[PDB]
Amino acid sequence: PARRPFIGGNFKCNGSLDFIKSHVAAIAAHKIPDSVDVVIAPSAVHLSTAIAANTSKQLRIAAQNVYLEGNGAWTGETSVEMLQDMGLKHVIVGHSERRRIMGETDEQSAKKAKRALEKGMTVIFCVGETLDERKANRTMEVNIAQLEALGKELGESKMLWKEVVIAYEPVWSIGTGVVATPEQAEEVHVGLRKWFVEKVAAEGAQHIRIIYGGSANGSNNEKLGQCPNIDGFLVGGASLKPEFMTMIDILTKTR
Amino acid sequence: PARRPFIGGNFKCNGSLDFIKSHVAAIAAHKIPDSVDVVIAPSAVHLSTAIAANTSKQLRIAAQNVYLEGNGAWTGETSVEMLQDMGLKHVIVGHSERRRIMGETDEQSAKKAKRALEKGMTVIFCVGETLDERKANRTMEVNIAQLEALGKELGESKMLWKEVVIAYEPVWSIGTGVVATPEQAEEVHVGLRKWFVEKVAAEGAQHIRIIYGGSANGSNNEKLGQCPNIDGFLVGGASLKPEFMTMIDILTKTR
């Protein structure tokens, strides 16, 4: 019932060509053990520059988003086919910025994930509740609904769930500095784990990785990483900084 | 009251790395006179590959979309800053696939265009009505509304309108093979021209370029290109093929 630690860095809409070259080189120069998964997600226009700068045998490059159709008449959108042609294994789907600011629906996120998973990618599937939703006592209702939408698309497929990494990021913690307490985070992760047991049964559930995000940084990650159901982190702001490497180290010696 | 001919090729969600290299090289090998603007818009993940393959002193690379915020927490989105850092001058905004399939609102398209124009880019701003809208006799009402949204953001700014290229693409003509007749297209373009006269006055209006798109190809472009208010084309499917170069030639000898 053991799971490989995972840390992802979401650069979001940040970076210049020079920054991508210099920052990817810095991360690639860091010692990354073979025991943990480390990925970084540059902006789409920077993926090929990042791949060229990535001299690490461990670090992987991920995309921040992908569309729910194959190649075709989808102006402004990227297909799974394009990502795989570039050699990428990982993609972030359902980030709360896309759900809450850009109108990506629960079904849209689920259909994106399904298509990527079917084609063999690993999907970092994001869920999370807003401050108001938590205030209304709907935290689990909201997170479960987002997962249920995925479940509707994936059913109980062994193949499909294998390469899902759930990222729980309370929306009130994203970019705000208001990191969840270890108790708040673990509480939600236990709820999600229980949901997985019901949907794919106990064995299937034991291997689903759940990472935390929302103001995770070099200074606060250790205590969170000690929680049994927190398998690692999705890191936004700190992923643009040297402290990202500190987080890699900490996740390693903790888990 | 004369305007430089313009042809843009929108690759949409198509291409592999090898295809971008080979197809951009083929277009770049073609003779392009200094008298016309020729741009191609690869998918975002392919922009840097396209730039590297573009050995032409005339051909320009454009983006298919851009977001309405600067760098920041906008997962999956590209900023104007990123495009300019990569050396791009042109971007497509408001393509009807984004408006009609992906929920991009008239205001969102307008705000994207305004931000790009303020920063110095040339924006290919797309407008168009659906078959049902035309059937309901609302063709001009719809197209004008889309333009009015832009006008609300740009006002009567001389600086801002200077680098707008309007692309009229009837939605019923996009990817369907059902190209507009020269009469249908010119009729709408005259309506748009009249609108510009009212909004920015006659002088400002005389320099706004209006291109046609929607099943424009190597075989049907000549007659359309002969229309006084059709300053060129936005080309989807044919832009992925050798006939794109034929269209460049035709636009040149016609206008």
Author numbering:
A (entry chain A), B (entry chain A): 2 to 256
Could you pull the original sentences from the published paper?
Since Giardia lacks oxidative phosphorylation and depends on glycolysis as its major ATP source, it has been proposed that disrupting this pathway could hinder the survival of the parasite; therefore, glycolytic enzymes have been considered potential pharmacological targets. Our results indicated that derivatization of C222, a non-interfacial residue located near the surface of the protein and 10-15 Å away from the active site, specifically inactivates the enzyme. C222 is at the end of loop 7, with its lateral chain positioned in a hydrophobic pocket formed mainly by carbon atoms of residues N218, G219, E223, F234, M248, and I251.
The relevance of polarity or charge in the inactivation of GlTIM by modification of C222 became apparent when cysteine was replaced by asparagine or aspartic acid (their volumes are similar to that of cysteine, but the former is polar and the other is negatively charged). The Ki of C222V matched the Ki for the WT enzyme, whereas the Ki values for C222M and C222N were, respectively, 3.7 and 6.4 fold higher; C222F showed a Ki that is 17-fold higher than that of WT GlTIM. Remarkably, initial refinement stages yielded immediate interesting results; even though the three proteins were crystallized in presence of 2-PG 5 mM, only the WTC and C222NC structures displayed electronic densities that corresponded to bound ligand in the catalytic site. The larger differences were observed in the region of residues 198-207, which corresponds to a small mobile loop in the middle of helix 6. In both structures the architecture of the catalytic site is conserved; the ligand is positioned correctly and the geometry of the active site residues is preserved. The result is intriguing because the perturbations in catalysis and stability of C222N do not reflect on discernible structural changes in the crystallographic structure. Thus, it is possible that the presence of bound ligand stabilizes the catalytically competent conformation of the active site, masking or preventing the conformational perturbations induced by modification of C222 with MMTS.
